[PDB]
Amino acid sequence: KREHEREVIQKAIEENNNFIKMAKEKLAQKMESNKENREAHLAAMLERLQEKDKHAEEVRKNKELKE
């Protein structure tokens, strides 16, 4: 009976620590995935805007060739 008593309370400690552990990893995974997704969206936005700058270079260069 003493050994069963030891096993119950160690099981309670084990399940609590695993709950904390799972919650910690899940949150770290979500934060990392969210950080990557948002940065990728900003990068795609700037890349499109830089592509417009590039097109504006061609237009001014294409005018200079006409003259």
């Binding site: 936005m45 805007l49 417009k52 504006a56 237009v59 001014r60 260069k61 005018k63 200079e64 006409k66």
Partner: protein, 424 residues
């Protein structure tokens, strides 16, 4: 504090911009010298949204004045409230744009854009927590159209997580004689669909019709049209400038109004409108086609989202009852797959001279009538390739016109797709 940086570009942009600052300065108790002489602490509570405060207790509009010719801005500096603007915030060229979107966007505008960005950067660096930007301009000209949209893209590169808001004046043959305006407008709409978060469609066709048919003005002047614009801009910015719960900043307004990122073109409205009043009458008027600043009949489409702002001393119970009344009796015109899509704000401070007023901001699929009108005028000239040499002469290509047209045509079909969508 949540600061907004204001930019006005070109003739139309600086004209309606100057009136906007005149109108809200009176509402906030600020005289042309920048001193406060009002009588309500509500006027100063959120004053920093639009005004910087310099020592001497002076309030300076957080405003930047841009043009490729000094004519309009000289008149602004000389007109009423001309001394309230920061002198270093006047940025002007000399060559002009000549109603040419290509000159504003790629040529003379690009030569001046970096000096404008220096002023924008300076105003933004001095912000506690910048909200974003509002631009006033026309789409029919050259400096407000091409350089205005160029400024939007360049600002978005440096402030990609800030809200970009425009008050964009749509051209109309009833008001302007210039022939190439459907070109400049279509090229500009091509930019606004991609690079702004919310655009108020100020339609010169609607402003004329209101002045002529409603206000009984035989020959409306730009002063007459701009009176509607300034009254409208006052109303649509009330929630940003006074304490309130609903749509109190640019981002919350966008989250409430824009269900799909390209469909961010709003139909503004105002009541009362009468030539030189109860809550039910005020509510019925603001939803009337005659009171829209865009020449679209909302009964020809469906509402995605609506913002309504009531101003003045009135019963909030009656406002709530009448706003519910309008939605229940016109349920066919509100999409059912966006529940509770109409939001109502109430501000105690009425505009100058009115005991009470209502301002309407609609995201309706009937805005396609505006874009169909512009596309109609665009394609009538582009099939003949009329006046294309003004634009190819600056280096552009016929492909850029083709892409702009198809993007605006795509926008129309997208409004139609969501107009036809059902819940089941």
């Amino acid at each position: 504090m949540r600061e907004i940086v204001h930019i006005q570009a070109g003739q139309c942009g600086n004209q309606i911009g100057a009136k906007f600052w005149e109108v809200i300065s009176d509402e906030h108790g600020i005289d042309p010298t920048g001193s406060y002489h009002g009588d309500s602490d509500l006027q100063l509570e959120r004053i920093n949204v639009y005004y910087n405060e310099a020592t001497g207790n002076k309030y300076v509009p957080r405003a930047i004045l841009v043009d490729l010719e000094p004519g309009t801005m000289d008149s602004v500096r000389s007109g009423p409230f001309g001394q309230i603007f920061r002198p270093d915030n006047f940025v002007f060229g000399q060559s002009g744009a000549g109603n040419n979107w290509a000159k504003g966007h790629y040529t003379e505008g690009a030569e001046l854009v970096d000096s404008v960005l220096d002023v924008v950067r300076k105003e933004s660096e001095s912000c506690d927590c910048l909200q974003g930007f509002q631009l006033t301009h026309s789409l029919g000209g050259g400096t407000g159209s091409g350089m205005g949209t160029l400024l939007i893209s360049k600002i978005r590169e440096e402030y990609p997580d800030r809200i970009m808001n425009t008050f964009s004046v749509m051209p109309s043959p009833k008001v302007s004689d210039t022939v190439v305006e459907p070109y400049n407008a279509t090229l500009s709409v091509h930019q606004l669909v991609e690079n702004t978060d919310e655009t108020y469609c100020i339609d010169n066709e609607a402003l004329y019709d209101i002045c002529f048919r409603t206000l009984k003005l035989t020959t409306p002047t730009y002063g007459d049209l701009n009176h509607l614009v300034s009254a409208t801009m006052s109303g649509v910015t009330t929630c940003l400038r006074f304490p309130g719960q609903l749509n109190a900043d640019l981002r919350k307004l966008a989250v409430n109004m824009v269900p799909f990122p390209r469909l961010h073109f709003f139909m503004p409205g105002f009541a009362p409108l009468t030539s030189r009043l109860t809550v039910p009458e005020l509510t019925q008027q603001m939803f009337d086609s005659k009171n829209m600043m865009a020449a679209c009949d909302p009964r020809h489409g469906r509402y995605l989202t609506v913002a309504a702002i009531f101003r003045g001393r009135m019963s909030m119970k009656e406002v709530d009852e009448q706003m519910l009344n309008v939605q229940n009796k016109n349920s066919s015109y509100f999409v059912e797959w966006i529940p509770n899509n109409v939001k109502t704000a109430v501000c105690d401070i009425p505009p100058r001279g009115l005991k009470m007023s209502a301002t309407f901001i609609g995201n309706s699929t009937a805005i396609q009538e505006l874009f169909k009108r512009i596309s109609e005028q665009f394609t009538a000239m582009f099939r003949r390739k009329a006046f294309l040499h003004w634009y190819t002469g600056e280096g552009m290509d016929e492909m850029e016109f083709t892409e702009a047209e198809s993007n605006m045509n795509d926008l129309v079909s997208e409004y139609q797709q969501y107009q036809d969508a059902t819940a089941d």
